[PDB]
Amino acid sequence: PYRVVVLSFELLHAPATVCGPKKSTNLVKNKCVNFNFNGLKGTGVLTESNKKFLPFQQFGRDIADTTDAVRDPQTLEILDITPCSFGGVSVITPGTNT
Amino acid sequence: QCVNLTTRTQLPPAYTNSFTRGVYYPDKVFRSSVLHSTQDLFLPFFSNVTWFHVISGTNGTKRFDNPVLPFNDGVYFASIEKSNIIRGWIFGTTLDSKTQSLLIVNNATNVVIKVCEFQFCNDPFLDHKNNKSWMESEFRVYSSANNCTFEYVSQPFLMDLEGKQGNFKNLREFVFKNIDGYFKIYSKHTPIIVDLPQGFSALEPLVDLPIGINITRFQTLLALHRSYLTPGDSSSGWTAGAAAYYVGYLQPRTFLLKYNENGTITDAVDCALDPLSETKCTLKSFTVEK
Amino acid sequence: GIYQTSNFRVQPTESIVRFPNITNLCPFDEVFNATRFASVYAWNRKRIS
Ligand SMILES: *[C@@H]1O[C@H](CO)[C@@H](O[C@@H]2O[C@H](CO)[C@@H](O)[C@H](O)[C@H]2NC(C)=O)[C@H](O)[C@H]1NC(C)=O
Ligand SMILES: *[C@@H]1O[C@H](CO)[C@@H](O)[C@H](O)[C@H]1NC(C)=O
Ligand SMILES: *[C@@H]1O[C@H](CO)[C@@H](O)[C@H](O)[C@H]1NC(C)=O
Known part of the structure; x- marks a missing residue:
């Protein structure tokens, strides 16, 4: 005697029922x-901001629709976002002949 | 089981004017000190809503206070009472048990949301005997549990936490909508009042669920008061009392929202209402110069 | 004189992913580690959601 279990899952993806991903990270x-x-x-870069969020708020925004702040799902702490430093570069020269 | 209601009653569906009520956070994002503009389903300002109220107390005629009402895209269900009678939002279907059916019966042992394919019953009314503990013995809305899709149990919902005073101890303001199938229920609780109040408020979102079904119209429910004091048939043998609740309707519209510095909604102005409007909205500022 | 050549950008070092916790699992042990089984004919039809 062998105990065998049969598994059947549907498709068409519209009734999102179970699933997964998971796969958390530090x-x-x-x-x-x-x-x-x-x-x-x-x-961007992550830091601490004194601004507070309402209990139902997920992530903030600002003028000109930029992602300002996000609340971490694991701990429910307000974090801020600021991109890496970027800018133009200029070269000063006194003349190749000189 | 379920019993068909009798002694049909007809009273005029009185009307009253809404005064800048029914504004809810459209998106789950945070802003501050910005006058954002949106366009979604809302309740038009100064709309004419269909008043309902519970009359014919004791066992005079007792009224049919819970008729069948249509559902196009949304409701602004409200409630003002003291004894916590309004419950049971049985809606979302064609009421023929054709597809998955929804109901919200709460303030039981715990707040629960039973959602099943049960075969319907013609007249719904929830038994609430005049005993020590009001036991919901008779689920006269259905007489079967043929199939079920989802079940929900939540601790906090419709909590009537207020002081002990004889005024109207609640002011419920719900918003029922189906975003392409997903049911989003927005709600809030308001302190007592001493007749819509001309005030401005925001509606915090609550738990949503996909389901996904065809929706035809709406039906409400009230708590019964059957007792041995009044001899009545199983069709209708309960005392009504006195209660009031309004019903509105939603439709697409364009609104302008002003956010506070903490993020709560503080003021809103409707577009396509008055000649003064469509100028306040156009300049994107509440103050307009000559 | 003075001239502009190009721009410079800092590149991100690592990547991190987060999610709203993992406490909500599907009950599966009670099926695999079940007190009793079904017969060859007929079968229990369980629903998980
Ligand atoms: C996620 O589930 C854990 C299960 O214990 C909750 O407790 C956290 O556990 C992690 C790992 O042990 C700790 O790093 C956290 O500090 C714990 N949280 C607290 C508040 O102490 C955790 O609360 C859950 N996170 C949620 C629900 O967002
Ligand atoms: C650099 O100086 C020399 C010396 O006069 C001159 O001939 C040359 O043209 C100068 N370079 C440029 C780019 O003008
Ligand atoms: C915003 O919240 C703070 C508390 O963090 C409060 O002191 C302040 O009064 C609030 N803003 C307004 C306009 O009331």
Whole structure:
């Protein structure tokens, strides 16, 4: 006698029922890093901000629709985002002949 | 089981004017000190809503206080009472048990949301005997539990936590909508009042669930008061008392929202309402110069 | 004189992913480690969601 279990799952993806992903990861701070906190993706630096969020708020925004702050799902702490340093470069020369 | 209601009653569906009520956070994002503009389903300002109220107390005629009401895209269900009678939002279907059916019966042992494919019953009314503990003995809304899809149990919902005074100890303001299938229920609780109040408020979101079904119209429910004092048939033998609750309707519209510095909504102005409007919205500022 | 050549950008070092915790699992042990089984004919039809 062999005990056998049969498994059948449907398709068409519209009644999102069970699933998964999971696959959590540790946290970093004060360094440029790509983040996927809950589905939003971006690049910047992480720090602490005194601004507070309402209990139902997920992630903040600002004028000109930029992702300002995100709340970490694991700990529910307000974190801030600031991109890596970027800017133009200029060269000063006194003349190649001189 | 379930019993068909009798002694049908017809009263005029009185009307009253809404005064800048029913504004809810459209998106789950945080802003501050910005006058954002949106466009979604809302309740138009100064809309004419269909008033309902519970009359014919004791066992005079007792009224049919819970008729069948249509559902297009949303409701602004409200409630003002003291004894916590309004419950049971049985809606979301064609009421023919054709597809998955929804109901919200709470303030039981715990707040629960039973959602099943049960075969319907013609007249719904929840038994609440005049005993020490009001036991919901008779689920007269259905007489079967043929199939079920989802079950929900939540501790906090419709909590009537207020002081002990004879005024109207609640002011419920719900918003029922189906975003392409997903049911999002926005709600809030308001302190007592001493007749819609001309005030401005925001509606915090609550738990949502996909389900996904065809929706035809709406039906409400009230707590019964059957007792041995009044001899009545199983169709109708309960004392009504006195209660009031309004019903509105939602539709697409364009709104302008002003956020506080903590992020709570503090003021809103409706577009396409008055000639003064469509100028306040256009300049994107609440103050307009000559 | 003075001239502009190009720009410079710092590159991110690592990547991190987060999610709203993992406490909500599907009950599966009670099926695999079940007190009793079903017969060859007929079978229990369980629903997980
Ligand atoms: C996620 O589940 C854990 C299960 O214990 C909750 O407790 C956290 O556990 C982790 C790992 O042991 C700790 O790093 C956290 O400090 C714990 N949280 C607290 C508040 O102490 C945790 O609360 C859950 N996270 C949620 C629900 O967001
Ligand atoms: C640099 O100086 C020399 C010396 O006069 C001159 O011939 C030359 O043209 C100068 N370079 C340029 C780019 O003008
Ligand atoms: C914003 O919240 C703070 C508490 O963090 C409070 O002191 C302040 O009064 C609030 N803003 C307004 C306009 O009331």
